[model samples]
Target: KRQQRSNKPSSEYTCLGHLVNLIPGKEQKVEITNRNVTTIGRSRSCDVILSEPDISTFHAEFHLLQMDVDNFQRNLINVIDKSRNGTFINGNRLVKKDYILKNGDRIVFGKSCSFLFKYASSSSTDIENDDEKVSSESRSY
Candidate 1:
């Protein structure tokens, strides 16, 4: 049964399952192996540091949550803006709010830095399909 298949313990679930691709310089990337809460900033203490002047010393937070729905389990990434410079999702500022992130969503910090979010699961396929839909829609215009 699907329910039975999805009932594995937390340890059994893949921990190294998420990624953040820093745009402009795609060489910079972060892997979310098992961290539930990851901090981003220019500070060395932060989990993901952006070495840029416009970015705050303490910038944003990435909170990973696991949800169970009728025996179906999935992970959700929530981005909390915690900086003076601000955080943005696809160019819109987040301010003092949290955004429920999806695969392929672009996260920007202040004015100079950006990242492309990705998950290492079936969610990747969903993101791909959305991109395809957008491509087809643009062609019609």
Candidate 2:
């Protein structure tokens, strides 16, 4: 699991609400909380499904998927590894993606990547944003 430093508020997302209790740094470990978990690259996509009950499950999978823990050492790589078989936190490794999501679990994409899930408790503003994205944005034909 990623190290949890001081309790700091990352973002007060209308979708997530009161994001807090996450790591703090600039190089790799940007910030985390019940809302924003990991931040990777713009191209990278973080996946958090219904498994492990939270982001911690996905975090563990990142390490177990590939490479030795002691050799590379883990700090922020977990948020970078990309995996098709699993969830790609930031397109770094191809590990397990089949996860059972739960409350208080978030997967931040690479560098302020916007991929917020459709939370049932999201605020009206959040709902509008989600709708806008889905409607305004579309797959390339």
Candidate 3:
């Protein structure tokens, strides 16, 4: 189920997700609009708060790779690990290295608190595929 950041629905690509707490169970959104880098941790300054005691005060950060208005420069989200406790993506921890974020990626903070990363552009692609399947079926007749 897709939810909105605002009450009024409008079309404009944006990055966002629900906190989705497995521990104790809590759900909220972290909006990543124009902010190039968004922080994740238990600290106050962090954009996405884990709030778990095991989570580092300042854990990991996400960087959006966006370039130009034309050409084949693919946009992406890059993640950087800052905690020794570990910042994991798909159960693989980063070695203080830059890793590109993936859709439906499970970003776990420390040993717990996983966040789901997804792009708004994907929602459009889903619709595009749905139309193509029907059009292809019609041409066969």
Candidate 4:
């Protein structure tokens, strides 16, 4: 007997958002599919590449944490620094530690590379709902 594959898509909580490059005045978006973790760096092999000279080969990583089930489920994105130059989330420098990412959070690599963490909802309807959550959490006091 052959195994049957389900056509139904995975739950919304499994979809992590994306990373947007904020440097060089260009819009570069890197999508995050269903992954437990994703890496970013200057290397071509990295999931998200930041090819500036100062950036390390394996700069940082994004780890997903599944939480919630009923509401518009949002996957938690965690950043781990893996570079000598250092990785900064928002404005704090990460040192071999994990940092939880929120929408609109700024991720800085080296000196010239930077990116924005954008929340990706599973569906169009979830976008509006997720936006409200993201906006409120990202606001400054």
Top candidate on TM-score is: 4
Model 3, 56-121: lDDT tens per residue?
A: 776788776566566743456778876687666778867647687766677787776776776544
Residue-level lDDT tens digits of model 2 in 1-141: 576887644443322322222334422212222333433222224323222222332233221121248675222222334332244333233354444333344544322322322223334543333523234556753
State the TM-score for model 3.
Answer: 0.60
Per-model TM against the reference: 0.62, 0.20, 0.60, 0.67
Q: Model 4, range 1-141, lDDT digits (tens) per residue?
A: 455576544432244677778755556877765467676776776667776875677777788666678876767778786567766678877654756777888878886678787777752553333523333554484
Prediction 3 global C-alpha lDDT: 0.64
Candidate 4 lDDT at 68 equals: 77
Tell me the tens digit of each residue's lDDT in model 1 across 1-141: 446655465533345455565656345666564467777887877767776875676788888766779897677788887557867787786754667887778878877677787766554333333523234455366
Candidate 2 overall lDDT versus native: 0.32
Candidate 3: which stretches are off by over 4 Å? 1-27, 68-74, 122-141
The C-alpha stretches of model 1 lying farther than 4 A from their native spots are: 1-14, 68-72, 122-141
Among all windows of 10 consecutive residues in model 2, the one with the lowest summed lDDT is 58-67
RMSD of 2: 17.5
lDDT of each: 0.68, 0.32, 0.64, 0.69
* Deviation from native of the Cα of residue 84 in model 2, angstroms: 7.7
Clashes of 2: 24
- Native-to-model Cα distance after best TM-score fit, residue 115 in candidate 4, in Å: 0.7
| Off by more than 4 A, model 4 | 1-15, 122-141
Q: Provide the lowest-lDDT 10-residue window in model 1.
A: 124-133
Clashes of each: 0, 24, 0, 0
Span of 10 residues, lowest total lDDT, candidate 3: 125-134
